[PDB]
Amino acid sequence: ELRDQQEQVKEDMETKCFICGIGNDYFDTVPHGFETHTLQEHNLANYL
Amino acid sequence: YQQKLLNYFARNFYNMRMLALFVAFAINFILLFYKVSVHYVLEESSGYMEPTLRILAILHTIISFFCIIGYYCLKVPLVIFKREKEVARKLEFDGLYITEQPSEDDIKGQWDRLVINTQSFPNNYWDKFVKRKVMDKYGEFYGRDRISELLGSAVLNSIDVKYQMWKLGVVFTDNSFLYLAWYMTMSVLGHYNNFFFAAHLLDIAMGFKTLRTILSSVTHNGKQLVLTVGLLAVVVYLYTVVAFNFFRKFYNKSEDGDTPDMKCDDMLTCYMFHMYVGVRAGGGIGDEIEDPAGDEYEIYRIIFDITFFFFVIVILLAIIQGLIIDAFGELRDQQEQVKEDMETKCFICGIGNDYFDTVPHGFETHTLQEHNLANYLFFLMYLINKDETEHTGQESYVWKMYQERCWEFFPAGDCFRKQYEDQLN
Amino acid sequence: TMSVLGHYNNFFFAAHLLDIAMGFKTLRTILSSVTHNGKQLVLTVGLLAVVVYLYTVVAFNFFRKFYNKSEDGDTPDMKCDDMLTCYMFHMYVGVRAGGGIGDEIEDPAGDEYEIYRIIFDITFFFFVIVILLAIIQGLIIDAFG
Amino acid sequence: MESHKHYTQSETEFLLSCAETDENETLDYEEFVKRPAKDIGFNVAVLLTNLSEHMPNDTRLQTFLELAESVLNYFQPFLGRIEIMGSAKRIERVYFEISESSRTQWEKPQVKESKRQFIFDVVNEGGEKEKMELFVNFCEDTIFEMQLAAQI
Ligand SMILES: [Zn+2]
Ligand SMILES: [Zn+2]
């Protein structure tokens, strides 16, 4: 069950924005776009 | 003729490797019929077993030699290809010995300096314009001659040593060559004592594939297993502490009464006793100890016994079993996931098997005609095999991108059909 | 043929009771779990045999004097000094003891091979008695899942 | 030369007129290295392949593909194609030859286990741009491997 927990948190973080919940489907039309979203715009770091 | 023999052992490495296994089996089968009076041999009325052992030991050593030569011929060039390729890429696109000059750690990089000054650095990576390109890239910012001084039946009469010292330092660090040298040393010391040939039967783990998968489960969590045993040791240390402080009088492993005492009164001896018959009893420490029939420490010794049982005998064993079975299930999850991801999606693009299957079988057309691992590698090998002048605009563009390492030419999220949908386009 | 040879000896009719596996559906599903990984199970037992062969090699080279399954002292010796007999002994009471080979052997109270016999005992336990059993159990439960 | 092709002035007796080399009442095997010809055939096969794949939907050319089917069957294993993003910001085909040594060395030996391990380790560990250079390193090491295995 703890394995399921960590599998699920990795799943949910990879699929989706922590902020928005768009999913990794709208952005990857452009190359690498989901990672642009998570690492430039809607950052935990830059928000803090 | 020497070259033919070397290519033979290289090509026949796996067959001779498989052969030495069964020679080891035959040796260890004949080892079963040994006796003592000193370790003689007494057969079942057949005096042919000793000469078979004598010749099979010689065959084992000889075929170990040939397997080692096959490995030296065959698999060593590949790892050296990887190494010189890494060194060239680090020199070009990072400038390791120009700017970084790495630490005492990264002993590979500290070792990979004497190769830099040689002529035959790019021996197998099939890229010889390495020194020239590094001279172009750092010829003025750091120096020009600095870079150059940093960089640069009649067969057995002239050969490099500078490159070859580096090469031998590489091959003496490789693991499979070290194993085959161990294999040879055991086959040689089999002459000193024939029982040493039993070490060669442990090559089954390397040989068989399915046995390697049987072994991967316990290998997958060896660290957590060793932590479980360390915790077991700590717990038995606490238990024997509680015993040595209180429960020493019951630790009488003597004969029937009115006998000399063979007791555990120290701490080290009691700890060895708990680790040797507390856990290796199937029931705990109370089995091998005088029963507490009517003592002031009756309930405390009972608590000691049952807690020792229900913790040491139960929980750590169950944790070891859970670790191995979790390794099994997790490796099953791994292979399930790789089959899932390969079926769903293009290895190249990552479209998914949704855009193409509008047409019949289209995802498989995508994977088997257009965006092939095979055809891509064959285009790579083609342009390595081709000449830069003969390149088209397409091939020149792509070869530029290759040797400057872009990977933008690769399709990603797109394809010929996605670009050219049949809509007058 | 078993029903005919039941005439020759009526005990041969007991072979026909093994048709329950073909007959019942749910029993076929009970049997499928162990059938699902029979090959890897047999490999586990072969590895067990190889490991006990190494253990009895280490015993026959070193630990023969403790292999005294005689009566109380001042008796004729019933010992395992050969290699085949020691291998049969380890396979017959090393693994079929619930505790290992040290239970059916004279205890090493103050010997030069005390720590080495102790290492032999605990390694025999924690490998042969534990790991291969757990692998068999994991195989059947993985078949179920 | 009766079963492999039919027999005319222009199919079999054409060859026997080309095979008028010796006066020993025989024929040497140099007529085959003389005839060389399939290097033209690959390029014309690629020409028709590009014409068909880029410009389908033309009955007039489909007629000629019926004519060239027998040659396209010859050049199909050696004719590779791949698609890549172009300098003009568009995907297009790259038609290109495939050798038989690389094919046979890529297919049968241990390298398939290397490809399995490659795909497994790639898709398990994964990476953003730690995928294509891994593929190219696998390809270059494999190209070296097939070269070394050809060398025996
Ligand atoms: Zn968002
Ligand atoms: Zn694709």
Curated annotation (Swiss-Prot), chain C:
Residues of the full protein shown: 4726 to 4870 of 4966
Domain notes: The calcium release channel activity resides in the C-terminal region while the remaining part of the protein resides in the cytoplasm.
Gene behind this protein: Ryr2
Protein purpose: Cytosolic calcium-activated calcium channel that mediates the release of Ca(2+) from the sarcoplasmic reticulum into the cytosol and thereby plays a key role in triggering cardiac muscle contraction. Aberrant channel activation can lead to cardiac arrhythmia. In cardiac myocytes, calcium release is triggered by increased Ca(2+) cytosolic levels due to activation of the L-type calcium channel CACNA1C. The calcium channel activity is modulated by formation of heterotetramers with RYR3. Required for cellular calcium ion homeostasis. Required for embryonic heart development.
Impact upon substituting D103A: No effect on calcium channel activity. Abolishes ryanodine binding
Mutant phenotype after disruption: Embryonically lethal. Embryos die at about 10 dpc, due to defects in heart tube development. Cardiac myotubes display enlarged rough endoplasmic reticulum and cytoplasmic vesicles that contain high levels of Ca(2+).
Impact upon substituting G94A: Strongly reduced calcium channel activity. Abolishes ryanodine binding
Post-translational modification: Channel activity is modulated by phosphorylation. Phosphorylation is increased in failing heart, leading to calcium leaks and increased cytoplasmic Ca(2+) levels.
Subunit details: Homotetramer. Can also form heterotetramers with RYR1 and RYR3. Interacts with CALM and S100A1; these interactions regulate channel activity. Identified in a complex composed of RYR2, FKBP1B, PKA catalytic subunit, PRKAR2A, AKAP6, and the protein phosphatases PP2A and PP1. Interacts directly with FKBP1B, PKA, PP1 and PP2A. Interacts with FKBP1A and FKBP1B; these interactions may stabilize the channel in its closed state and prevent Ca(2+) leaks. Interacts with SELENON. Identified in a complex, composed of FSD2, CMYA5 and RYR2.
TM ranges: 4-24, 43-63, 124-144
Protein name, UniProt field: Ryanodine receptor 2
Assigned protein family: Belongs to the ryanodine receptor (TC 1.A.3.1) family. RYR2 subfamily.
Intramembrane segments: 94-103
